[PDB]
Amino acid sequence: SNATRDALLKAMQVGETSIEAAEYMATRFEQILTKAKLLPECNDMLEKIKEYAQFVKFKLLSSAQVWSGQERPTSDYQNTQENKAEFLASHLEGLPSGLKLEVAIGDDAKILRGFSSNGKMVEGDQLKTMDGLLEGWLAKNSLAISGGAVVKIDNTGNQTKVDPQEIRQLINDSEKGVAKYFADKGVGMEVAQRTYQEPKALETKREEIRQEIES
């Protein structure tokens, strides 16, 4: 049980606590490795730590921002969401700059979303406005988030499965996309689609790093 191993493991654990700690995790790993003269032999561990930090940042942002949209509730789901969004689009003051939406659609239709401002988590009523606008865009395209997945909703409220690549290209569309919907609602923003990462993939990445630390 060498002290460097405990330090690296604590650095990984601390980096998983918050987005700021994840942004600084790779720097801390480099400090520990250089202080132990473990570079350039441990360069691969540092590269994996940087990539893991990016994965952890998106995981923390998506998880912390809890989705409160109507899963099963439908009926007149389209018009009600559109009206709530026409309201959210007047009460737009007090929204930060550099707004970014990170969205991942898996091959199994699983969806993850994160709203960020200049690299910082959007919280509170600001987050409520952004999520309401996203729910409005979803309703306009007859879409809902149920069970952590994107589903198509019929007028009566029937839930059907959706095609992932179709939704991926719909998000980035110039006319029917999220960015256009937000802009027409008075919100300047950037949409950055990222690859969906299932839990087991993140667990494998973490296990790789941990095994290299314990080696």
UniProtKB/Swiss-Prot annotation:
Q: Name one GO biological process term.
A: protein transport
Q: Which UniProt keywords apply?
A: Cytoplasm, Protein transport, Transport, Virulence
Q: Which InterPro entries match?
A: DotY (IPR056465), DotY_N (IPR049927)
Annotated spans, Disordered: 198-215
- What happens in the null mutant? Deletion of the gene leads to a reduced intracellular growth in the protozoa A.castellanii and decreased levels of effector translocation. Deletion of dotY results in the absence of both DotY and DotZ proteins in the coupling complex. Deletion mutant shows significantly reduced DotL polar localization.
Q: Where is the composition biased (Basic and acidic residues)?
A: 200-213
Task: Provide one Gene Ontology cellular component.
Answer: cytoplasm
What's the short name of a Pfam family annotated to this entry? DotY
Coiled-coil segments? none
Q: Where in the cell is it found?
A: Cytoplasm
State the protein's purpose.
Answer: Component of the Dot/Icm type IVB secretion system (T4BSS), which is used to inject bacterial effector proteins into eukaryotic host cells. Part of a subcomplex which recruits effector proteins and delivers them to the core transmembrane subcomplex. DotY and DotZ play a role in effector translocation, but are not essential and do not influence the stability of the subcomplex main components. The DotY/DotZ main function is to optimize secretion by modulating the delivery trajectory of the IcmSW module and the localization of the machinery to the poles.
Q: What is known about its subunit structure?
A: The T4BSS is a complex nanomachine composed of several subcomplexes. This subunit is part of the Type IV Coupling Complex (T4CC), a subcomplex composed of the DotLMNYZ core and the IcmSW-LvgA adapter subunits, linked by the C-terminal tail of DotL. Six DotLMNYZ hetero-pentameric units may assemble into a hexameric nanomachine, forming an inner membrane channel for effectors to pass through. Interacts exclusively with DotZ. DotY and DotZ are co-dependent for the assembly into the T4CC.
Report the protein name in the record: Type 4 apparatus protein DotY
